[PDB]
Design a protein around this nucleic acid. Sequence first.
DNA 1: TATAATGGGAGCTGTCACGGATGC
DNA 2: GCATCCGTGAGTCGAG
Lengths: 211, 210, 346
Amino acid sequence: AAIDPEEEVIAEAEGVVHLHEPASILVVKARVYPFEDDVEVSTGDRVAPGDVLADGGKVKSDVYGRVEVDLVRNVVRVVESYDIDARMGAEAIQQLLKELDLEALEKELLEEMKHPSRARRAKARKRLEVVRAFLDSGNRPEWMILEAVPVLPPDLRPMVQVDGGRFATSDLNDLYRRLINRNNRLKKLLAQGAPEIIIRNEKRMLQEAVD
Amino acid sequence: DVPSKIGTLLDLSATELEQVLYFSKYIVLDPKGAILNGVPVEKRQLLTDEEYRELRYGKQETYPLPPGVDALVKDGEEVVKGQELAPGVVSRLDGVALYRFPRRVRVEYVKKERAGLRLPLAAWVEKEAYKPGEILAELPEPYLFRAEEEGVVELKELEEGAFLVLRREDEPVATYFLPVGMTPLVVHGEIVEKGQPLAEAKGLLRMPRQ
Amino acid sequence: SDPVRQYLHEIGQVPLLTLEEEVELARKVEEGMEAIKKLSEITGLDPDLIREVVRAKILGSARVRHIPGLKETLDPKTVEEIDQKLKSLPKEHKRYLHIAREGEAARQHLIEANLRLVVSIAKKYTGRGLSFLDLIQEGNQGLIRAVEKFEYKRRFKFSTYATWWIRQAINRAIADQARTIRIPVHMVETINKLSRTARQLQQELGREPTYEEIAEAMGPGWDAKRVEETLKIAQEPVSLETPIGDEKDSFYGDFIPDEHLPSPVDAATQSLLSEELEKALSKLSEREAMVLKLRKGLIDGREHTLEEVGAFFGVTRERIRQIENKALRKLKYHESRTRKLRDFLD
DNA sequence: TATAATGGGAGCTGTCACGGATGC
DNA sequence: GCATCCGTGAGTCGAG
Ligand SMILES: [Mg+2]
């Protein structure tokens, strides 16, 4: 097929097609699963071994991976991959903080305190001070991560007209503006479904803004 | 603020927590049975972008083909690491090689037709059919295949062997097939009366491969 | 360490597209959009909702969030419902789903592929009031607009059509952000034009142009007053933390008096005013004192009309205004007598 | 809205006096 | 166990 209909290549008579001289060659580790019938999974779906894909369940998945549906080649391809969850930033850290059960860590470190090594006893103490601090306090560790960022009352970061009729203002306003701008841009970038390597950059810049 | 409190609770070094927060490296919440370099992925492991891409999105690579050089392998066909993909290209990995933007598409068109040939009875080997490469006959002396019709000659030479089609006006009156070992004595667009030699068969003669 | 170097590395990861790869991705994107349209025609669903569902499944459940334009809250439940109703289509109809998915994937790979061009364009925009990285991200937004608006049929390379949208988005950002007090984009254009004009005039005249010269140079409609008002309106604020001295000691804000909260003197004078007024209002009868007090609003802070004080005291508006008159008059006499309330008149 | 354009720059230098963390 | 790195301190009022 081509842009203009007169440049197209149509088959004159009955025959078979042979591909020669590819511009390049793409080598992928993948498992091929040809299909003669309507396929139950579309492109992008992640699939474990023993999953239904095409032909009403006659053909299944051998490996772990990601589904590339080829309509041209009439084959369901699976690129070998896992479902593995790996994150970045304060969201991941907030997760790991939320997951922590305090008493368990306290007791583990207590067992760690009986160890003969001086260093290990030391580190166990240092950690246990933090853990017990959070415990006795009633403050959740995940609060060390921010969701809602507080805003100082305006009068404490004034925008004021001086004698000359000119305005003078605090730097906290510029910092807050940086924060808000990068944040909003992140919300719009997420709403529009931008790639990773973009959202990543934005998130990084957001953290540096808060900092 | 050292020692880091967040870093303390989660047992993460300054460099590690920096890498995670500032987006240098991924950290794994639920490995979901992931495996890297033969070892299974333990929770809270640090992965580079290379490693996370290899694990999550799978491994792949593309190699260039210099213009006017045909691939030594077929589309869809399995490959082994080190196996040369082309005269100038060697694959670094194992898997399914795929064609990217083929420059030339060769179409083999199927043709089923009917054509006659006449041979001395002693030379012929009787067979119900002739597979490619199989001997059609064996001739002790040079023999001249003669035209059994009059007309203009359409000569088409295949990879080996050929076809002659005689036509009066616009309608073909004859089709002769010349197998291997027969040299055509006529050219395209020539006029032949009945009885004049179209070709010469010499020695052994056999079917073409195509 | 250095965020810019890091981002340039990440960008340096994705390879550059050959003309073939580019046209292929572009085509897949366009045909994908078409697929979503036809799919909306078949299903009768909203093309937007469909697009967000396909996008969701391509990106994964890692990214799922409610979109402002959508009428429904987008969550794995609803996207699973919709995706399942998409999986229930006949083969020829269910084909368009695969087309859509392919489209989205092509889109992502396209953006990620062309991310370098944005950097190369934004590196020339430094110093204009925005950070390098901010410029890069805005340029990325531009790139996205370019991808979604691109048509490969014109046989143009992607760079040519992308550059326009990238520059446009960057410029829009610079105009909409870099001022602490926000100014409309057209107004910013006018101000920058005024600056280019003034700079040209100063380059020809060998001196800073007056308001009149700039006015004349800006054509008709521009007088000196307009130029001055434009410049005035363009004045940026100054930091309160700017040092006034060699040492760390002096801050500019330390010299700025607060005019808002009343001084102790003003407060004491207001107090003595209230007290003296209560002194002079007690010299009346409680009725006329209360009428005056309701009319001037010393009681609730607001002034009642003649009808309201007359309805409250149970007399006519003429009568209530009359006793207001005599109260005020007695006050005038008392004031002409003791002269206690004269000093409060400033 | 369409020739094509695809990895950034400035560092900035005569203080100790260190404290605790990190490293062969 | 002992060299080495990173962050945090380094006088007061006055005028400016
Ligand atoms: Mg004028």
